[PDB]
């Protein structure tokens with residue numbers, strides 16, 4: 001919950017930015033402070049990364065007494081060519097690139113000093129998880145110029161991040177599809193579902209191959225316990241809105257669930273969305 005809350009905090013600071021300033025310049029202190037907190041950093045800088053994957057040497061923000069940035073330092077070059085966190089384990093100790101879901105490297109965290117007892121894989125993993133999610137947000141919410149649905153774009157980018165979270169870090173997420181089969185209750189059920197949206201959850205309102213309303217809900221960074229806690233909350237909400245006498249199911253709601261796993265193979269998510277939920281590739285990528 002700490003990660004989710006840290007990310008929601010950042011996201012809100014992004015939403016309230018004037019839109020005059022670049023997110024990365026104006027929120028640099030906050031981004032670095034966030035990373036410092038999770039890595040127990042002591043000496044570090046945050047740097048803009050250019051188009052061509054080179055770093056701008058003048059830092060956006062520093063922590064402690066960070067020395068000048070060795071542009072062609074081995075750790076820095078390796079990090080930026082590989083697009084992944086690299087460390088010196090076994091001047092700089094760790095470099096963490098901030099890479100979005102499309103592989104654009106937006107920024108670079110360069111770590112001079114962190115306590116040795118946290119200089120390990122557990123810590124490197126939190127740093128890499130946080131960096132990727134910050135990256136997405138820095139290019140995110142103020143990004144609606146493409147003539148596709150804003151909602152549709154944010155849904156698929158969040159889904160792509162949760163897939164990386166699963167694949168790379170074993171982090172769990174859950175997708176629900178609510179298929180609404182009764183036209184009498186359809187709109188009112190979907191409105192109830194829309195109003196329940198919480199935290200980093202994202203939603204997409206769709207119509208399937210049989211013309212029925214389908215509400216997709218993605219629960220980022222949420223375990224199997226938790227997913228069940230969500231459906232439990234949701235059932236209480238349906239009981240207030242409609243009969244406590246009645247169940248979700250008696251309103252024409254069919255629930256489909258897909259758990260994102262490190263185990264879940266390649267085209268498993270694809271089979272879930274299409275030829276199962278009956279959606280297509282123009283609704284989610």
Ligand SMILES: Nc1nc2c(ncn2[C@@H]2O[C@@H]3COP(=O)(O)O[C@H]4[C@@H](O)[C@H](n5cnc6c(=O)[nH]c(N)nc65)O[C@@H]4COP(=O)(O)O[C@H]3[C@H]2O)c(=O)[nH]1
Pocket residue numbers: 001196197198199201219220222225226227228229230233
């Ligand atoms: N992804 C996702 N998961 C969900 C959702 N609803 C419930 N869960 C899961 O169900 C657990 C219990 O939820 P609760 O009864 O609402 O009990 C919650 C609730 O009373 C409170 N809480 C947590 N987040 C919020 C929030 O964003 N707004 C409000 N008003 N209360 C919250 O803290 C208790 C424990 O919350 P958690 O530790 O998060 O633990 C949550 C969470 O793991 C949802 O819309 N999306």
